[PDB]
């Protein structure tokens, strides 16, 4: 929390911050951080479920 | 003024040597970033250097320089203390069997410091006292002789600590054997201390 | 300082912990001979003046 | 195969030169290039020494660029110097006035024209101020180590040569590396205009203006002077109390450095100063 | 008074003049001065500083229009967190017109890792804050370490609470906090 | 002084030829490189260089962290050079156990055989049958007679036996040679046109430890990075599954997890097979009859059982060695080891 | 004669002493010193290359550090083994004749009657490694003298040698490899292990490199290694497979007849009375090694010799005895 807060507060408190994204993923959201919401933080939420069998069809077909 | 290139010399340094060669080439142990083997200057010899020891070495020439390194107790101690104040010839043709030392066992109230400083002090010799530390101060003794020597610290089965204090009981007996062995320096005489099991 | 070998002559550290041997100046006498004392050399001349309380 | 007994006269030109390219001696490797005239075989004259542009690279014959030197010479040759080029001078600051191999390979490169090839190296870093003592250095022939190194006649200057007797460079380096001697020259005119410049360095415009503020200061400030002179002149006789003592006990030997006298010497000649002045103001009073 | 004695960084210790520029001003001891190879002369003083001095003396945000962007706005203050934010953009909007200074307090500043003596912290900087006569404080994320110690607490949330007594103790204790601000800011 | 007469002879020319070679700036090692003219170099004496490349050195002969000669003077790479011990002390090209010693493992043995011995000997078929070779196997869990599997792999190339890699040899002093160490023994693995090697004791290297993790992650950035080889061969061999960071990265690259336990009653007479080139067993000795009278038997335990029944038969004084006079000796070092294991 | 007092001037005043660190076959080697300086230059006169065994002190310069000479080191290998053939046979003992003969068999086998070596096929040179709860020499030097009637012989004893000087590493280790390397016919015996008994994080290191370096990974059969130690339990379970893989044996007890196995050897060239009984001397004794009853036997020679006089009496042989009784208890 010391280094991750550190991340944030260099994701809030830097208004050059307009380079280079910073891309991030989870592979759970049991426990969501409710200080990731804002512009320059993780606001981009698009929920990716477990694909179905027709969609692993279509995956595994093309791979 | 003729120095003063000697004072541009940036001084010199301090030289130990710890191992002397046979090809007239003596290494010398120095500062760290140093053991800097190097034959002396020719004025100086080499076989009077020995090793172990600082000598002087310049900076730059690397050349060495030279070597660097109770009136019943007086009544009865007249005959021990007053004897040796006024004749210190008579210890070779007094053939009398002069006592060696003499010890006083009991409560040391009065007669430890007060009487032997203070006959001591009549017979206006110098007063040494005992106060592994215990045989550089016997070298001492070994030197400066002539003196009024007193056990004032020491008086307070076999084991190591018993091997250890038969050092000094090696001592003392070796003491018997210079004293009692052979006299070679007039006006030796000691007093002993001891109050307990010993 | 560090120790007097003999007249007219002795040995001083260094800062940087070497020992040096430079002969001392005529014109100083015995008493800045302290075995225990602030002496200082010249930077090029390594020679001493005076001695800091 | 022939060899004289060269010396390198030095003005004070070139020294007052080096002494100003010593000031800008900074560590950085510096370069120069000295100036003369050869008349015969075995005599040396340096007139004119300029500087030059420091580089990256350093001493270097690459540094020395063939049309600067080339054009500042002919700008030399319109003006009233008509002097060639007779040596190159450096400073080697911190690791000794010696000469590293590229200075000894520039020095084989530079000599194929001059055969003298005159080297100097100045370092005032190191040196003290009480001595400006300076050595010129010379490259020998490395054909000539089966003969003797140097046939040079004239051996009594080498005692003169013997001043840098430093132990580790001199010989700790004289192999294939050998030095000259150096004498100096002044006329006349440096002589009376160098010596009246000086001693009018150290006197007034008019000299009479700070004359005046001594002999009246001797009222004000040097009492001070006085009086504290008369308390080391007490302080020290607090001693001499207990001096006749030691005096009236041994008589034998001396253990005292301190001799109690030169210096009430110097005592009695900063005191003296009130009655120099005296008439002075006697003087400036009277007319 | 002349000619003193100068301590260098790297250990051997030397001894200088007075140069005739300067004054017997800066010369008085305890302040760091600068030498020169050559003659050993002065030109100048070097002031000390620190490593997060820098820090707290350097990050300055520009921008003076954000104090009238914030809309229509017209010892503590609480900003919490309803379904509206930029609170960031408000205190950073004062904070990026004056704020007098820059001294943020960031809610992972007291974490203290090893033992729990943020005592020395909480005084520490609140008596920077007693020492310099204007002083602003930003308390952003407080609900981190805003613990309601309901249960049993273990020694992680103890020493937070801990630092939440000193707070009490030095807001409604025995020292009055009529010249300092603080803005605790929040979620939920 | 016989030897110092002819090059004291010869130290005439050393004169001249001492002006070259002189360079030498304690031999300085690089970091790493930004653009090619200026070069970020590093002194033993934690002091950071900089120079620019001289001209009598190749750009392309630079490699990230070299010791190479570099002058004092003019701070130029005038001439590199080629050159820990553990390194080149781990090198092994030595003839060992064959596939006679195939422990009952019926399946197991081809599953691993198809991968160590079909891909070298049929190149196209798997390239055209398929995409690619199998990747590798992997022999872990219980010791058993472990090992024994590994010089038969070595053992059992039709060109040349290779090297094989022990674990317990990374965790030592001064961490950070493994880096080196795995990138030059890959290097030479690029040198050995397409060689296979094997990585012994994962558990010495897996399982503070973040000095550990620099040589382990490391490795995984070398084993999953194609950039040596990302076909040749992956087989790892630990006692223990307590190595989290491998089994969770294996699964890009590592595959076909097998086991090896114990052998079956026709194994360990093969195992005496192997034996027959041993110790001089005499014709009269049964290798079904002395393998079939000691249950849980792996070749570890019966080679330890040839071994005391070898040193026995050493004690024996004997021409030859034979059954009636080591038998002792076999259920002696198989039933009072077995007492208390 | 010129050309030999010609350079001179390398070895004149601007002289050193560095560190050589390994010579490059490209006739130029690295040196190192008290911070590491790396210089290459071209070898000259005076040095051999051959028998120098890098990673010594040699000799350095103020100039450019051509190497003009080498000094040798380590006196200190002198006192590590012996070069002596003691009259001492396996036949002068008695009791443990098995014992014995089980390391006799075991490491006389390899190099010396070789039918029954090299035909089998096997080759474990490893040997084996004992322990002596009486230890102090007597009992192990007992068995490993066996091995010293007609043979060479490598001794090495206690771990101090490691532990009394800063951490070096295994180089004295590659030493006793390189003198066993060109020593082949010889024995290495590790007496007074005490290595982990006795930083401490490099002695498990260095302990464990020890047995890394010992296990012969590069070697072929060369030399046959005993171990001797004193405690079994001191030693790690590591140190255990990888060097111990040929044999290991167990010692009795020395309480009444050993000890007086031990007093009859002991007591087999001097001369005693008829008086002197055996059952106090082998009962006022408990867990004494052969070192003391050796001394006992030396003093009480030399006690009894006072007399001019070789009979050793009961009275002085018990004189004698107090001290076995004293130093065991004190
Ligand atoms: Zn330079």
Not at chain 2, 25 to 44: A, T
Not at chain 3, 5 to 32: F, H, K, M, P, W
Not at chain 4, 27 to 46: A, K
């Amino acid at each position: 929390q010391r280094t991750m807060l550190e991340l944030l507060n260099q994701l809030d408190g830097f208004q050059p911050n307009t380079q280079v994204k910073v891309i991030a993923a989870t592979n759970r959201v049991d426990i969501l951080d409710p200080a990731l919401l804002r512009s320059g933080r993780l606001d981009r939420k698009i929920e990716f479920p477990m694909p179905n069998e027709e969609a692993r069809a279509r995956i595994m077909q093309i791979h | 003024r003729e120095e003063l290139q000697l004072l541009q010399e940036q001084g010199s340094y301090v030289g130990e040597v710890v191992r002397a060669m046979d090809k007239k080439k003596v290494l010398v142990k120095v500062h760290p970033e140093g053991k800097f083997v190097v034959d002396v200057d020719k004025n100086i010899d080499i076989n009077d250097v020995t090793p172990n020891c600082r000598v002087a070495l310049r900076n730059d020439s690397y050349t060495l320089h030279k070597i660097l390194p109770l009136d019943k107790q007086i009544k009865e101690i007249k005959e021990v203390i007053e004897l040796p104040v006024k004749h210190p010839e008579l210890f070779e043709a007094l053939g009398i069997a002069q006592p060696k030392g003499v010890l006083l066992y009991g409560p040391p109230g009065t007669g430890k410091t007060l009487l032997a400083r203070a006959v001591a002090h009549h017979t206006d010799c110098t007063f040494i006292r005992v106060s592994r530390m215990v045989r550089e101060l016997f070298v001492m003794a070994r030197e400066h002789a002539p003196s009024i020597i007193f056990m004032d610290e020491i008086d307070s089965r076999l084991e190591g600590g018993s091997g250890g204090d038969s050092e000094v009981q090696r001592t003392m007996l070796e003491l018997l054997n210079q004293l009692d062995g052979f006299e070679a320096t007039k006006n030796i005489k000691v007093i002993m201390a001891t109050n307990r099991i010993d | 300082f560090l120790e007097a070998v003999d007249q007219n002559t002795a040995i001083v550290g260094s800062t940087t912990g070497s020992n040096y041997y430079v002969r001392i100046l005529s014109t100083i006498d015995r008493e800045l001979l302290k075995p225990n004392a602030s002496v200082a050399l010249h930077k090029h001349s390594n020679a001493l003046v005076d001695v800091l309380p | 195969a022939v060899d004289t007994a060269e010396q390198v006269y030095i003005s004070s030109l070139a020294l007052l030169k080096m002494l100003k390219h010593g000031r800008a001696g900074v560590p950085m490797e510096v370069m120069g290039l000295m100036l003369g005239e050869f008349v015969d075989d075995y005599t040396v004259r340096v007139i004119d020494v300029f500087a030059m542009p420091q580089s990256g690279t350093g001493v270097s014959v690459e540094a020395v660029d063939p049309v600067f030197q080339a054009k500042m010479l002919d700008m030399l040759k319109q003006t009233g110097r008509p002097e060639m080029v007779v040596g190159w001078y450096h400073s080697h600051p911190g690791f000794g006035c010696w000469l590293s191999g590229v200075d000894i390979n520039t020095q084989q490169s530079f000599e194929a024209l001059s055969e003298r090839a005159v080297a100097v190296v100045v370092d005032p870093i190191q040196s003290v101020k009480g001595k400006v003592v300076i050595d010129a250095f010379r490259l020998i022939n490395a054909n000539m180590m089966v003969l003797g190194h140097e046939p040079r006649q004239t051996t009594s200057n080498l005692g003169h040569l013997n001043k840098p007797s430093i132990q580790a460079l001199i010989h700790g380096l004289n192999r294939h590396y050998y030095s000259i001697t150096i004498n100096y020259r002044k006329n006349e005119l440096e002589q009376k205009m160098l010596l009246n410049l000086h001693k009018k360095s150290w006197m007034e415009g008019l000299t009479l203006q700070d004359y005046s503020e001594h002999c009246k200061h001797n009222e004000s400030v040097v009492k001070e002077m006085l009086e504290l002179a008369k308390n080391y002149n007490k302080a020290v006789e607090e001693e001499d109390k207990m001096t006749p003592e030691q005096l009236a006990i041994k008589n034998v030997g001396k253990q005292d450095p301190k001799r109690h006298l030169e210096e009430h010497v110097d005592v009695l000649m900063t005191s003296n100063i009130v009655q120099c002045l005296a008439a002075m103001l006697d003087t400036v009073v009277f007319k | 008074e002349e000619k003193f004695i100068v301590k260098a960084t790297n250990g051997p210790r030397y001894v200088v003049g007075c140069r005739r520029q300067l004054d017997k001003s800066k010369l008085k001891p305890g302040t760091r001065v600068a030498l020169d190879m050559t003659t050993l002369t002065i030109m100048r003083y070097l002031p000390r500083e620190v490593d997060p001095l820098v820090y707290n003396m350097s990050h300055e945000d520009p921008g003076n229009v954000s104090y009238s962007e914030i809309g229509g706005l017209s010892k503590g203050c609480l900003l919490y967190g309803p379904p509206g934010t930029g609170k960031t953009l408000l205190a950073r909007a004062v904070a990026s017109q004056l704020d007098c200074n820059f001294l943020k307090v960031v809610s992972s500043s007291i974490v203290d890792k090893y033992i729990g003596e943020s005592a020395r912290l909480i005084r520490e900087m609140f008596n920077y804050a007693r020492d310099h006569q204007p002083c602003i404080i930003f308390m952003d994320e407080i609900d981190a370490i805003g613990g309601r110690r309901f249960s049993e607490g273990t020694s992680a949330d103890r020493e937070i609470q801990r630092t939440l007594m000193e707070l009490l103790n030095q807001m409604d204790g025995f020292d009055t906090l009529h010249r300092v601000k603080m803005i605790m800011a929040t979620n939920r | 002084a016989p030897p110092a007469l002819w090059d004291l002879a010869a130290d005439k020319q050393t004169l001249q030829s001492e002006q070259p070679l002189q360079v030498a700036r304690c031999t300085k090692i690089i970091n790493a490189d930004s653009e090619d003219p200026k070069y970020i170099i590093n002194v033993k004496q934690f002091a950071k260089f900089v120079v620019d490349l001289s001209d009598q050195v190749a750009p392309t002969d630079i490699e990230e962290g070299m010791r190479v000669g570099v002058d004092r003077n003019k701070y130029q790479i005038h001439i590199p050079l080629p050159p820990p011990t553990v390194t080149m002390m781990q090198v092994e090209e030595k003839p060992d156990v064959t596939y006679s010693d195939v422990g009952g493992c019926k399946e197991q043995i081809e599953k691993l055989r198809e991968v160590v011995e079909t891909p070298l000997l049929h190149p196209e078929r798997f390239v055209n049958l398929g995409i690619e070779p199998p990747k590798g196997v992997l022999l872990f869990g219980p010791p058993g007679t472990g090992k024994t599997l590994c010089a038969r792999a070595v053992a059992n190339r039709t060109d040349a036996c290779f090297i094989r890699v022990i674990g317990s040899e990374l965790v030592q002093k001064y961490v950070g040679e493994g880096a080196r160490m795995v990138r030059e023994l890959f290097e030479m693995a690029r040198t050995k046109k397409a060689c296979l090697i094997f990585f012994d004791e994962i558990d010495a290297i897996g399982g503070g430890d973040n000095e550990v993790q620099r040589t382990m992650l490391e490795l995984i950035n070398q084993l999953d990075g194609f950039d040596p080889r990302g076909n040749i061969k992956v087989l790892m061999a630990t006692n223990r599954p307590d190595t989290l960071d491998p089994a969770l990265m294996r699964p890009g690259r590592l595959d076909r997890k097998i086991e090896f336990s114990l052998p079956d009653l026709e194994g360990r007479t093969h195992i005496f097979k192997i034996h027959a080139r041993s110790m001089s067993v005499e014709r009269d000795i049964r290798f079904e009859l002395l393998a079939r009278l000691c249950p849980n038997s792996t070749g570890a335990e019966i080679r330890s059982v040839c071994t005391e029944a070898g040193m026995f038969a050493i004690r024996a004084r004997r021409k030859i060695a034979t059954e009636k006079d080591f038998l002792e000796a076999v259920n002696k070092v198989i039933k009072s080891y077995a007492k208390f294991s | 004669e010129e050309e030999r007092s010609k350079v001179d001037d390398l070895r004149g005043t601007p002289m050193s002493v560095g560190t050589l660190e390994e010579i490059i076959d490209d006739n130029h080697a690295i040196v190192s010193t008290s911070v590491g300086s790396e210089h290459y230059v071209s070898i000259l006169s005076f040095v051999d290359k051959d028998l120098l065994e890098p990673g010594c002190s040699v000799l350095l310069n103020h100039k450019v550090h051509a190497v003009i000479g080498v000094l040798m080191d380590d006196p200190l290998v002198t006192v590590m083994k012996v070069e002596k053939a003691p009259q001492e046979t396996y036949a002068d003992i008695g009791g443990l004749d098995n014992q014995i003969q089980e390391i006799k068999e075991s490491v006389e086998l390899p190099l010396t009657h070789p039918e029954y070596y090299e035909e089998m096929g096997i080759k474990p040179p490893k040997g084996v490694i004992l322990y002596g709860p009486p230890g102090t020499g007597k009992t192990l030097l007992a068995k490993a003298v066996a091995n010293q009637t007609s043979a060479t012989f490598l001794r090495v004893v206690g771990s101090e040698l490691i532990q009394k000087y800063l951490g070096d590493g295994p180089k004295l280790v590659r030493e006793l490899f390189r003198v066993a390397e060109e020593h082949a016919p010889s024995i290495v015996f590790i007496d007074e292990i005490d290595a982990i008994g006795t930083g401490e994080r490099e002695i498990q290191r260095t302990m464990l490199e020890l047995l890394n370096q010992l296990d012969g990974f590069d070697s072929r059969g060369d030399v046959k290694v005993i171990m001797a130690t004193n405690r079994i339990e001191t030693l790690d379970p590591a140190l255990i497979r990888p060097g111990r893989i040929d044999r290991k044996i167990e010692f009795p007890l020395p309480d009444e007849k050993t000890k007086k196995r031990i007093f009859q050897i002991h007591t087999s060239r001097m001369t005693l009375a008829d008086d002197v009984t055996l059952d106090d001397l082998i009962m006022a004794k408990d867990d004494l090694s052969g070192a003391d009853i050796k001394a006992i036997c030396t003093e009480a020679g030399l006690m009894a010799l006072r007399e001019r006089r070789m009979k050793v009496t009961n009275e002085d042989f018990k004189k004698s005895k107090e001290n076995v009784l004293y130093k065991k208890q004190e």
